[PDB]
Amino acid sequence: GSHMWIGVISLFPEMFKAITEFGVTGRAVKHNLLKVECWNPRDFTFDKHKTVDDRPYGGGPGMLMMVQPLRDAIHTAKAAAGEGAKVIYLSPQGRKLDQGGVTELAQNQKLILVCGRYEGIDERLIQTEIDEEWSIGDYVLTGGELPAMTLIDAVARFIPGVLGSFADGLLDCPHYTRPEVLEGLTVPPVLMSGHHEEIRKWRLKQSLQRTWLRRPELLEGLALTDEQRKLLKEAQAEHN
Amino acid sequence: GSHMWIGVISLFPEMFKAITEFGVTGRAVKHNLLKVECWNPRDFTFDKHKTVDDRPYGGGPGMLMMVQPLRDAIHTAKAAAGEGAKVIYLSPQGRKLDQGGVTELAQNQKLILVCGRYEGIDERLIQTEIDEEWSIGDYVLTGGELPAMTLIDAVARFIPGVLGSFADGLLDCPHYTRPEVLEGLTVPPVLMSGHHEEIRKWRLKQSLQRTWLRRPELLEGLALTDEQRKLLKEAQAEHN
Numbered sequence A, B: 001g002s003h004m005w006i007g008v009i010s011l012f013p014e015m016f017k018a019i020t021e022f023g024v025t026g027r028a029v030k031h032n033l034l035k036v037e038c039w040n041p042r043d044f045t046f047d048k049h050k051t052v053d054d055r056p057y058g059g060g061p062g063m064l065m066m067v068q069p070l071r072d073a074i075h076t077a078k079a080a081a082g083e084g085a086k087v088i089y090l091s092p093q094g095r096k097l098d099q100g101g102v103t104e105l106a107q108n109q110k111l112i113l114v115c116g117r118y119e120g121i122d123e124r125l126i127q128t129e130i131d132e133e134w135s136i137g138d139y140v141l142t143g144g145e146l147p148a149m150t151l152i153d154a155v156a157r158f159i160p161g162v163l164g165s166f167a168d169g170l171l172d173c174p175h176y177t178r179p180e181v182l183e184g185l186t187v188p189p190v191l192m193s194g195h196h197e198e199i200r201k202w203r204l205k206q207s208l209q210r211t212w213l214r215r216p217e218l219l220e221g222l223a224l225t226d227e228q229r230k231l232l233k234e235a236q237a238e239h240n
């Protein structure tokens, strides 16, 4: 099929075993649908102690990524990638990732992901080496690895053959499995009823309600259908 | 010091080696500041094939987590945790994580994190076993593991002794390290000037500008100081 190549720059490549050896993503790798290839800046040093950090000009308490080893790793990856590979830097200054963002990134046959450690990377590397800066969320982590893994996992689902909802813009509906009663709680009868049309409508109505209650801002980005407006109005009225 | 305990429920506990064997978080574990303990629902099965998924009532193309193995793993973890441990389910329906959210979660000496696979878990388990539902972002992943790892990494930074900015509400300023020129790009002179006061003000002004340009909504949640209003107005005017 149409595979995907992901180059990764990281001081901790082994972290990426978490997505390449396990589950859906581990299957995608075994089936050559997804390929993840790592370069460690530490391999690109020349001093005895393999120094990969550097002090920031203007002072400040933290450290940055040494420019030369990082720059050399990026260039190597760009070369092994060949043409067309987009270079993504994960950081809290980047564009905020959401599923629309994932769909766009997914359209790239080749990606290179730069995972920063310490307090960041030199701003000049961002201008010259980085095409897009992205954030997986407004929280602060110890490094760009986990966001890179999150990105990889998210886009991998778009690769044909990888998988075996939410696209309506709404939160998911409540799901139920065995047993029929649990701690004296029972499955909603309509799910047993066998009526696929009653069931579809009930699930949709739940999603509308749950989105309304939990994430009302998600509802303003939406141009609801006749049916959805109906079912939401019913659910809003019944919350009284 | 004041350590942290994190119980984890996952079909893929080995994924968590990515945070427990590496970097800052790997150090926190080695120094008993952070403890991560995993229970696999697969260990709680009794059938020959260690079945951990189950069909959803009302039909639908996907699978859910079998209730019994998952429920038994949760209960075991709650018991090993003892009193006070809060139980977090990671999912796209949860409350949206941000750093404020991380600061709150961080105040818990004990956490238990439930990582869902397949298309989710039974809604009745959520009502009875789960205290808080959280999302790391509006994107869809193959499982709750990476969000759980993200959460762990984020809160770990609040544990005293773990670490060795952004709290002003603003994006970070541009950072620079060796060399002084790079691809014919030079370090802003003021960072060389040695004037800690000029430097502080220049960095602040950058953050104000970068927040304004990249994340203007972050600026509306802010009650700017006299100084910040000054420097922002200057930066807005100079964007002309």
Ligand SMILES: Nc1nonc1C(=O)N[C@H]1C[C@@H]1c1ccc(S(N)(=O)=O)cc1
Pocket: A062, A090, A091, A092, A116, A117, A118, A119, A120, A134, A135, A136, A137, A138, A139, A140, A141, A142, A143, A144, A147, B165, B166, B172
């Ligand atoms: N969110 C994210 N999406 O992508 N990366 C994300 C992230 O958190 N990266 C962190 C490693 C970088 C970082 C930057 C600044 C500081 S600080 N304020 O201590 O100087 C600490 C850590």
Ligand SMILES: Nc1nonc1C(=O)N[C@H]1C[C@@H]1c1ccc(S(N)(=O)=O)cc1
Pocket: A165, A166, A172, B062, B090, B091, B092, B116, B117, B118, B119, B120, B134, B135, B136, B137, B138, B139, B140, B141, B142, B143, B144, B147
């Ligand atoms: N974001 C997140 N924050 O925490 N978990 C997050 C997440 O993405 N979890 C996914 C495993 C669960 C999931 C749910 C529904 C479907 S679906 N729409 O294919 O039925 C697929 C996957």
